[PDB]
C-alpha cells in the first residue's frame, strides 16, 4: 500500500486523511518524524509483524540553525557482509556535543555565544581527519551529563570551561605535543614538591581489552579482542577488561579505540601529584609539561599529561597539579576485520 | 606584561578582584585593602576572600566557596527571596603597575547561606561543566504536549497574549489587580508575573492560581508595590483542546491525542 | 579513555555490575543519531 511519511518540518502540515483516521481534534505533528501507512494490508489475520526503519541526519532539525556543517558528514566503510559492503554516514562527535549544548529541544540548550566555538573546530580538526564518527542512540532518555560522559569516553576528550571567557569548551586527549617546546620543571624552575613519590609495583596492569561496538548495518553488537603480547609473554595469566564502546559503527574504528585504551592503560602508568608555585598558573587540565627530579628521586625528565588542578587563593600561593603519564592517539596495530560471510 | 611578573620568584603584587554581574547591574570588588581602579572601573576593597578556584571535573567539590560580607547588596539580593535570574561572578588577577587582569573564573552564584560567621556569608559558585544533572527526558509521547508555554516549539506569540496591570493590593502569597477581574477563572493557571526591580532589573516568577481579581503564586513574594505594572502572562491546561481554543495554536501542538491506547501487536488477538 | 582519566583517583580495572538503562533496546535502526522520544 501507499505510505505517507511526514518529516516534522517546522511548518509541517499533513493530509486530512490521517486526521480523519485518527479522528477528532488532531495536531499537525510538527517537529517529529511521523510515518502514516494508509495501506490496507497492515498484515494478514495472523498477528501483525514488527517493523524497523533506518535514517540519518547531518543538518536537518537544528534549533537555531546548524553549526560548522562542512565537517559533520563522517562517512566511512562500516560494511556487514563482505559482498554486501557499503559505507555508512557516521556523524561527527564534535557536532554531537555541540548539539547537546546548543539546542533547547532537550537538555540545557546553552546559547551559542557561551560555547567556545574555536575549541569545537579544534575537536573537528582531528575527529574528521581520522574519521572517528558515531551512531549513538538516546532511547529511554537519561541524565544529560551521563550521555556526555559516554560521548567523551568514545572520543576520549575533556569537556571544560575556558579560564578566560567562561564559555563551555571541549578538549581531546591526543598526541598534540612536540616533546621539545614543553617547559621543564625541576626544583629550580617552579617545582615545590612531588606529593606522589612512591611506586606501587605497577607492573601487573591491564594487558587485554575486549571492545564492544555496534555496527548499524548489522544493527547489533560486535566485539573486538586486543592482546598486548608484550605483557602476556612475561606477566603470565591475563589481566583483561571488557569495555563498552557502543555507537562506534565499524571494526576499524573499534580497533582504533581498543588500541588507544590498551596502550594508554597498559604502558607504564604513573600518577604524579605535583606541588607548584605560580609557575603553571596558565596550565589547564589536559595540558602537557615535562618534570625532572634527577638528584633526589632519579626520574629522567619525563613528559606528563596535566589532569586535575587546584588553583590557590591569594594566600598559600601554590597550586596542586594532578598529572598522568603520557596518553596516546589512534593508530594501526591489528587487522581485525572479521568480514562475515 | 602580566605573565612575566606573575611567574617571577622574587617579584609580585597582591590583587584578586571580583565582579558580581546581573544583566549589567555591577559590583566591582577587591580582596586587597586599597581602592584598586582598573579596566575603567573602581574595584572597592571589601572583605571578600576566595577559598580556591578548584577545577577537578567533579561537581560539588569544585564549588567555589566565597566568604562574602553580609552587608553587601550582593548578599542582600539573596535575603529571603534570591534573584529569579542567575547572577554571574567574574574574578580577575592583575598585579599593581599592571593593567591586564587576566580573568580566572566565570562561575555563577548558585546558593548562599549565612551562619556561624555573621560578618561574611558563604557563596557557592560552580561552573557550566558541573550543572548538567538535567532530566534529559523531554519528548515522551503523551495525551498532552510537554512543551513549555511560549517556548521555542509551542511558539505561541509572546505579545498576542499580553496582560498587565499595577497591583491593586499586595497580600500574603496573593496579588489583586483590576485586569485580572476581566478574565475567566484559571486564566493564569501556570502563568507568571513580570516587572522591573530597581536592582534585579527583569524579574519573572510564576502564578499558581487565578480567580476574579485575585491570583496565587507558586513562589514567594519578594515584596511588591502598587506602582509598576505586573506584566502577567496566561498559562495553559496544556491539553489539545486547551491549545486549540485558547491559543489557536493547534497547528503547532506537540501532544498526541490519539495515542492508540498502546494497542499492541502481540499477546492477544487484534487487527 | 576519559574513563581512564576518571579513575585517576584510584588507589593504583576489573568490574562486575548490571546496567542502568541506556538507548540500546532497538526498534528503529539509526545510522546516525536523530535522538528519540521516550513515550
Ligand atoms: Fe501550546
Automatic annotation (TrEMBL), chain A:
Position of the signal peptide: none
Domain Tip attachment protein J: from-to ranges: 141-309
Name of the protein in its database record: Minor tail protein
Organism: Chivirus chi
Gene this chain is encoded by: 30
Residues of the whole record sequence present: 70 to 410 of 1296
From TrEMBL, chain B:
Protein name: Bacteriophage phiJL001 Gp84 C-terminal domain-containing protein
InterPro entries with a match to the protein in the record: Phage_phiJL001_Gp84, Phage_phiJL001_Gp84_C
NCBIfam families to which the protein is assigned, alphabetical: phg_TIGR02218
Domain Bacteriophage phiJL001 Gp84 C-terminal: 186-261
Keyword Metal-binding attached: yes
Alphabetic keyword roster: Metal-binding
Annotated positions binding Fe(3+): 154, 243
Organism: Chivirus chi
Keyword hit for Metal-binding: yes
Pfam families with a match to the protein in the record: Phage_BR0599
From TrEMBL, chain C:
Top-level taxon in the UniProt lineage: Viruses
Protein name, as recorded: Tail assembly protein 1
